[PDB]
Amino acid sequence: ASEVPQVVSLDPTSIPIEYNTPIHDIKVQVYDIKGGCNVEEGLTIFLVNNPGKENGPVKISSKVNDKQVSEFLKDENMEKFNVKLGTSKHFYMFNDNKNSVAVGYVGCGSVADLSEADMKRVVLSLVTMLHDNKLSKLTVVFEINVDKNLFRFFLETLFYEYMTDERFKSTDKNVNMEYIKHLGVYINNADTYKEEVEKARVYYFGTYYASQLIAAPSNYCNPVSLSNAAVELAQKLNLEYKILGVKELEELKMGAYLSVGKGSMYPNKFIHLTYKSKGDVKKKIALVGKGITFDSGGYNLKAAPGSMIDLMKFDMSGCAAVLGCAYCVGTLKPENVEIHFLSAVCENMVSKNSYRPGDIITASNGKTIEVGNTDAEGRLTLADALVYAEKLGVDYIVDIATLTGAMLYSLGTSYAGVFGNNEELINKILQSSKTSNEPVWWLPIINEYRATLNSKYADINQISSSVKASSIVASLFLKEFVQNTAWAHIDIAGVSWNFKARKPKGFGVRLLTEFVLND
Amino acid sequence: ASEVPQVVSLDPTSIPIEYNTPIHDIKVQVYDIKGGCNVEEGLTIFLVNNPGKENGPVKISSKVNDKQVSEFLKDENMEKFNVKLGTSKHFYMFNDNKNSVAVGYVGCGSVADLSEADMKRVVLSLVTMLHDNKLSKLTVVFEINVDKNLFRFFLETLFYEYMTDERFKSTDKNVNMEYIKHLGVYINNADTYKEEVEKARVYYFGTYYASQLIAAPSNYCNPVSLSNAAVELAQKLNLEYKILGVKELEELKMGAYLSVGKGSMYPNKFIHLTYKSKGDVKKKIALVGKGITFDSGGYNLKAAPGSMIDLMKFDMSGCAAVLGCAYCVGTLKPENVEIHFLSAVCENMVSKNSYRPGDIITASNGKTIEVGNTDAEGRLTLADALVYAEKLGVDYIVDIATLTGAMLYSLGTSYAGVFGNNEELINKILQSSKTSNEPVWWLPIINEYRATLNSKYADINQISSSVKASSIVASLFLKEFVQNTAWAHIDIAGVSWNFKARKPKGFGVRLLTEFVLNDAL
Amino acid sequence: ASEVPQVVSLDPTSIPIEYNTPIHDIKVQVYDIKGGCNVEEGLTIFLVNNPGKENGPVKISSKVNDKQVSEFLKDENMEKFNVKLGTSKHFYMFNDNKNSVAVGYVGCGSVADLSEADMKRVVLSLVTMLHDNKLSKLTVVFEINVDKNLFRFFLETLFYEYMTDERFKSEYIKHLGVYINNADTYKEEVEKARVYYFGTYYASQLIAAPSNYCNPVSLSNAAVELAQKLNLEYKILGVKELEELKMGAYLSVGKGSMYPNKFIHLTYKSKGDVKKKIALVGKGITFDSGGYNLKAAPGSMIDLMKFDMSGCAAVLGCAYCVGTLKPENVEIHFLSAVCENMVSKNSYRPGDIITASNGKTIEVGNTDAEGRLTLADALVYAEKLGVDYIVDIATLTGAMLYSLGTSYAGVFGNNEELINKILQSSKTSNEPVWWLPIINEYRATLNSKYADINQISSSVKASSIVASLFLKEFVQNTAWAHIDIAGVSWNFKARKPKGFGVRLLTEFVLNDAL
């Protein structure tokens, strides 16, 4: 652990992190629907659809073990309500023991198989029922068909959206915010879904941990404090760790990564965590996250309208996903694998000491690079991280990065893009996207654009002379720093931030963990 | 001379410079064309035109001392080819010694007298024939008429365009790059052209030396490393030299120049080299180059669309031209002159320490200046350099500077602009432009605009309140720092960088050298 | 005369023109300073400098034949005032006859020879006193040195700046006295100055007239009226004739306007043998919206674009001076392809390929580069006349503001002798111009993939030079010059036209052409 430099004594010296969240105190119980539902304290919510009948009526099919509640939920009373996706109603009544109970439903539409986006809308409606209501228990009755992965995603998303991050509130903490202590779930074939519960709780926290790092502003979350947080995480999980400082980075000749950080008051810190299975290692994987804790753009300052310099604390979202994956992997302990979690962390600032547009810098593999724009800093840091990763001798290198704003014009805010030099690895990532329910789309590395990276003076240009397809150009540049290892690159610039809710998504934690686990 | 400060240990501490270039290893021989051409080895190229005939046929006039090549070059076999400017052809054949030779031509058009731009196109086509062909020797046969200056220009341009700067390549060096070892030239009245060969070689390196400094990026070429390179050049040439550091600049009260450099991690360095002739000194000249090794714009940051911040390593092109001229002058050693080569070198950066828009700063002649835009920094450094130059007691002061982007809208990328306070000196610059074949156009210093530099609080404003003709306004500002000396100002902002080829031109080395040489004779 | 189309009945159908101005009623007398200055009525202003002593004191050299005013003008009183250029004071007092007179000075700085810009500043300070005092007479005493041309420029500028254009709103002195050393040599400049003033003011009236008043129909109608008043030959070519002449570049620009294109051709021809023939071509865009390349960028000044016919205006003001002064042995053609560049379903588009009257196909790269298209067909028309010189004058390129600015126009040409004649006309008219090059290396950037030539360059930012290269393609074998007045036409500080070019072109015709 290194000391965080301060300008004034009021500058923070660590990222506040909540490990023991209220979600972790919730006791989860799963019951089979065949035994009927007991309707007692708290709120009991039925998830109901009506296939093929758009905005069709609500009908409750499950057996309910209360005559009063069964009478309330008969078809004649329920048919006045409809299943329109995201719609909900609350019910009040006295049960057979003369206790008042609260019941309701969330509409799940008319399409038998819900997409991750549909299921998220269902969860958001459920969370509105949890907020502003002091409940000790929620019970959820599944009258829809979900596979095991989608059941886990429901739980992960519920936990994540319910959790409210108050680390930076002082005088404006929500004085009414209370969390349930119990969650009941009724589902058909419950025994087959029970193994998903604790996996969902792990995936939730890896994702929420990533969100905590992302949302932490750049005065709290800087290269020293972020690498310190990684050390503490490794200590908690018994992972091996190494933080490389400037002197070691100079010895490794990491000139592209070091140049980006020249202008910052925070020394560069390179994170290397390692998980190794106890048994024979059958696969070795390097996960590389882009870790720019604030991106001002440098001398190519983000001053253009719409460049959103105020959100650029999120430019370490890739590092956060890799560290959240380390939480999940260190918790779940997969066998037969060795995983390296890597991030070349730095901050891109304006200073007398900053690198300049036009500088020619030398990466750790000897390639000279002409810098065309100091705001294309992520690919420079990743170049040196990829050289480092390939020296580890791994089977797969996967990097994840908020690399190019063009991602918003190609895939938008819902799907990440994956690029790579190896179809088998790309297909493994796409399969992990399916089982994590974090959507990714394969995009091409178009070799015809490579000539636009030819530099008159250096071995290569950082940016293209003509091509505006920057996500593809960036991938061509990165490809030059992986010589003979299967490699894939996930550009999460469009999917990292939830603009409607003004908070991170923690995108990539579950994708990467499913990738490690399914291998 | 001074230690280059570093942020990380990987930051470079000197500019790589190649002094012996492959061009210098080319042995050049000039033969009179009257004796006929020998065609034995390598590539032999005829420079051919057809005066008055639009796109007329190739017709070879020279005698060729080989029966086989003469048969190939007969009019009947050449009439399928035309002399269109820049067109070229290659021929393969066996000579009388049964050795395979390569022969060809480059078309020089139908207009007997070629401009500098025309000759450049001819040379560029020649260079394409040298690339991707591993040849030991090139022979050029002039079947066009060129004067001595244009023959020298041909060689200088050939040398400059042929040379490839690989200083910053490591893993991507051209594995196939081979240079000729011999250059043969056949020309009429060869004895009068032989003296141009070594002059062309000197002018080539002065221009290529300037290009090397310009193309070197701002992490390599900073105020300390550039002034160190100037000392090393002065030492090799036996020039007197002095580098003024911050404490001496403070004692000289160089407050405009020092303000520009406040925001940089590199201390300001003022270059002063001197060439002095052995005999009676009849003329004393100060050459002043703008030397901003990187121009971020300062707090008036180059953030507007079209502001090319990524190219601003070229903002010391004027300094580079002056040092390239020092090489040529120190090598050719003219008589009757003393030449001072000056540059107020610094870097324009954004920092807690930078000067601010609105600051009022005091120049070394006591004039107070209101800073209106920190990106108008060149005229500030030049103001103090001009005060220094006039204190030397010279006959002429000439400054050269990448000063105003408006130059691209006035003269464009081919012609530099010259402004000045003295008609005789302006005419001497124009004559040097003609004999150097570096084009310059005289532009006016329009005194009506001077009132727009009136400041409410300081003695003068740095920038105009209303006038958009910024090349003229900048000249008017500079004019305030020359009190009673003949002075001219050459704005090379539009001509310094070759946008098509993505490389410097080294513009001004030959212009300034011709200026010195013509005034010395 | 053609009928001006209207959208509503309130749209104007002619340009109001004032021919008889109050300036024409001023009686001018020039007296030699030797013998002393009489100070009897009105306002008397001394033009005074102080060479070497910058902002030095005012000192009056002339004898004044009034004892009271002489006391006022004593060195001890005048040294409280200084000669900083444009500074002025004037006081009211009783002269020896107990008549109220006003006496004062305008500072002329510390340089002995005033430039045209310095003299404008002097005149502006003089006019400020004329606008703020009810006066029957002004007397100006020259204690500075002016040559004959600068003296005439002084009078022209005084008349022009003093005149106030009130045509769109809903007392002048009657006498001007001038005391100057060697007065007899200056007397012939007075009525020349009055002619040059009105030609310049006439051009100013056409320029300042808004585009609803001054459109292609009403401007060509005004040109006919001028020709009739001056006994010039005249011809207005309409769309049917323009189509028969195949002027496809000019007609394309006007396609989107509600006003039909009108080509003005006036002719002055000397009574004696014609020894020199000259065509003067003025750009006449009565409003330049930019077309589909609309003037929407910050700083594109769409609200000022009524001035895009300033070249035509100068050519017509020149026709006034020439028809009035009647030079011998010359025939002069005054030409303008007048139209309006508008946005409509009917406009030409960026990318259109159009065919000029000499058969050249042109690829339109920007509809706001419309002036060179109209000038292209005008130059083909001019060369068919068989003239010795073609001079065009045009508000062509905004790049002039970045090259020479608002004070000097640029001249380009294909013939050095003709360029030097224009520069000499600039010296004697005191309308400054600077010679700029036509750089042949840029010509390749006008090579079009599909048409014979591009209208604009894709790569070269030296737009004034590229525009000249384009125009040169439409002059085959005639001495030709092109004067770009885009930067000098409008006086931004005073919010009015300059009428730039009228006097320059007249001096060229009178003195330098033949």
Ligand SMILES: O=C(CNc1ccccc1)N[C@@H](C(=O)NO)c1ccc(-c2cc(F)c(F)c(F)c2)cc1
């Ligand atoms: O890609 C570029 C330059 N071209 C470009 C920029 C913006 C839009 C289209 C093209 N610059 C990147 C950078 O600075 N990398 O270091 C960058 C810039 C922006 C975002 C981002 C993230 C978000 F969440 C957004 F909602 C968003 F609009 C943009 C990510 C990376």
Ligand SMILES: O=C(CNc1ccccc1)N[C@@H](C(=O)NO)c1ccc(-c2cc(F)c(F)c(F)c2)cc1
């Ligand atoms: O003139 C200005 C104000 N801006 C401006 C105005 C009008 C037109 C263009 C820019 N700023 C100067 C500066 O910053 N001086 O210190 C400067 C700025 C740019 C270039 C340059 C060089 C080139 F080779 C170019 F191709 C180019 F477009 C611009 C030179 C000097």
Ligand SMILES: O=C(CNc1ccccc1)N[C@@H](C(=O)NO)c1ccc(-c2cc(F)c(F)c(F)c2)cc1
């Ligand atoms: O030159 C162009 C191309 N654009 C452009 C390029 C470089 C710089 C500025 C504009 N467009 C011309 C046009 O539209 N011709 O038809 C045009 C445009 C503007 C003015 C004008 C007149 C004034 F009096 C001004 F004060 C002024 F700022 C501009 C004249 C001609």
Ligand code: NA
């Ligand atoms: Na953060």
Ligand code: NA
């Ligand atoms: Na450089």
Ligand SMILES: [Zn+2]
């Ligand atoms: Zn970034």
Ligand SMILES: [Zn+2]
């Ligand atoms: Zn960036």
Ligand SMILES: [Zn+2]
């Ligand atoms: Zn600069």
Ligand SMILES: [Zn+2]
């Ligand atoms: Zn600048």
Ligand SMILES: [Zn+2]
């Ligand atoms: Zn226009």
Ligand SMILES: [Zn+2]
């Ligand atoms: Zn126009």
